[PDB]
């Protein structure tokens, strides 16, 4: 089963990328040195190899969410959602290392380097969820491959083979949005604003002397002004859901989690509301399978995952994170 | 728990953008050096891919209020309007940390390395203020996630979905609005209005000997010349609040503050009046629940709040900000 | 705090608009090409989004007064009508730059980054004038927040659409009076609003800004000294939303009138020596 998820970022994608990167009042990232240098944390970008010429393919960076990050995203609408819920309805309650095992891929960071038996591994990918992430302590494979976010870009011709051909946005695709946070006792004003400290305005006065201090010469003061590079809202992406020869549990439960997909965020920038997106279409080995109440056909998967849940059990989970 | 907040705004706009912009006598925003450039402070923008032509999307620009700046609003109209008056309604006592640690998220700029327990994390995510602005040492996450403020334009068409289909505005929504100083002393004029200055009218004269000291020839004297781009007033904004998992007491202290948002201002430039607006509609998933007389419906929220009101304390407040 | 006036002009407004802007003849406003070149004052302009084609929003153009020199406007009145000849007897004289911080926002330029103790700040934003007005070496936000004067016409009905359904101006409101340079004003008998907002503010800060529009009829805004224009006069002031003016003036709301006299009686030039001092 190869899955064509493709969304719609209503608000800025942020996937904070590493490295110590830099911007200036003005929008040129890592500046030489000397210049005003405020930090910069950008979104993940992915190079990618698209025509620059239209004869010649170079390495164009391109904004992504990480595969990583919409993995783990998944696996929490599919746990959260509906592995939790038919867990505490039929009163199963697992423990803490399986309750790791189902969100993390294990319990502890050491994996035992033990081959686990073979008939473990069959119920083990015969499961709905277990089969679709793997991991535990003897590192089992799922069955779901989860590729990274791709924007239907001009960058990404190379990468989207078909169907996509009047569809593609061009040009910058992000934005440097900048941020900062005063303190808040400089914003005072009012001794009815003193109020509700203790000691009072002498004590906030106190508070104020510290930052004439640290306007002289390690503690931070509150007084920060930064910047994070966002990809643009409105912004449609393609996602690639991918299974490894799967049971229609698993597609099922995949579809479960597409279906109920609304109210989470892609993560990243949480605060900001950032990572809310909507879905457009979700294409199930190619046919169209998306309506605007969720995923309309795929019956079978859906019954079989509603099969799946009923007699869904924490013993499963514990042998899975049962470490040898 | 999604909340859009559709405002008009009764004066211009004006969020300062970071960047050192510049403007001629007549458009012509940062132009090639040497035409007289004049500094310009613009609003903030924000870049969207939005359906330009049939079968193009460009990442047009569209200006707005930052979602940082509303989160912040949002959280000190709570603080000044609901917390405050209940805690000194009561008694209760903040600390500089406490204090520094709700309007700011932090107390410090240090956040600490090791984790808070999980039973602070479930008694401060249950707490109606705290749950909705995390942050503290521990680096706690909110439940509510704040958008940034988007008018109802063809540029945010992508962005909105669902709903405002019609108020669909087409042309242009910002102005460079010129504001500038003199120095009175170079417009005195007679020495009885002079007479009001101690030393008489020949300290006046030096100060005067000074500008033109200054004119001739890096002490800043008066008399600047300067430009801000706002947006137009009367414009339709839409915002979006949303929650993750929030208890009901949660969602009736943001709906206390959607009551008296209007008495704040959604812009900067605090003197020139901006930011004045009035709240059209309350979307409480979707629900209208607003009218003239602040908001009609939501009450168990309401009671959930008032019920959380009473039985709040400084000392959940103290233990968010203690760092270990 | 929401204080609300309504004007009437009874010459031309000439709120004059930096433009490189020129005309032929009234028929043509700004011409393409460059035969007979005369150039142009614009008034000050105002895009707002109104409701014109009937159903739609579109950016239309209004003709304002700028808050910003409204702002100055209220400052000079009270500085030069009561703070002055309140200040100008019991010694307490204003320094220089005392009087620049008052009469402008600040005494000089480059402002120092240093803030302020907070005792200042608590201090400073309880006096009459200092936090109506702020600003100065540490920038003080200061209460008072001044609106650009609004004229009541369809262009500006969404913003004013509460408390007025009718008296509601429609068509043209601008004119051209040349003297070969001409120059672009409002028509005279147009009802202005201007918006005074205030937030937490004491008793002689409302009182000083009421005191002000009492008598705000005097200082001519917006125009040529020369040229006759700034007359106004004010009918229809409201007080939270409740009508305070008459042909006498305020008569009504007299506690703010008594706060801020006790204020003015107990003036002193040592608060405006704290604002302009800058501790740099």
Known sequence: MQIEVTVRNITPIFSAAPGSNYITIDGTINPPPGVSRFPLVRTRMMYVAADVGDGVIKSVPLQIVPGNTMRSLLRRTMLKHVIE???????????????????????????????????????????????????????????????????????????????????????????????????????????????????????????????????????????????????????????????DRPTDAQVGLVLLALNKMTNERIAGGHSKDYGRFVIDGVSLNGEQVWSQSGITGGEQYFDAVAEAIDGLSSKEFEQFAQSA
Chains 1, 2 share one sequence.
């Open 85 to 243: 819920p038919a867990l505490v309805e039929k009163g199963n309650k697992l423990s803490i290392g399986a309750y790791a095992t189902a969100y993390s891929g294990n319990a502890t960071g050491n994996p035992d380097g033990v081959p686990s038996s073979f008939d473990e591994i069959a119920t083990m990918r015969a499961h709905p969820f277990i089969g679709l992430f793997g991991g535990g302590p003897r590192m089992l494979e799922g069955r779901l491959m989860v590729d990274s976010l791709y924007p239907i870009h001009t960058n990404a011709e190379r990468i989207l083979g078909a169907g996509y051909e009047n569809e593609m946005m061009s040009g910058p695709i992000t934005q440097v949005v900048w941020a900062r946070r005063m303190d808040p006792i400089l914003n005072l004003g009012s001794s009815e604003d003193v109020e509700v400290i203790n000691g009072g305005a002498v004590a906030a006065n106190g508070w104020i002397q510290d930052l004439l201090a640290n306007s002289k010469a390690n503690g931070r003061g509150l007084k920060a002004f930064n910047a994070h590079e966002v990809v643009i809202p409105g912004l449609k992406w393609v996602w690639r859901i991918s299974l």
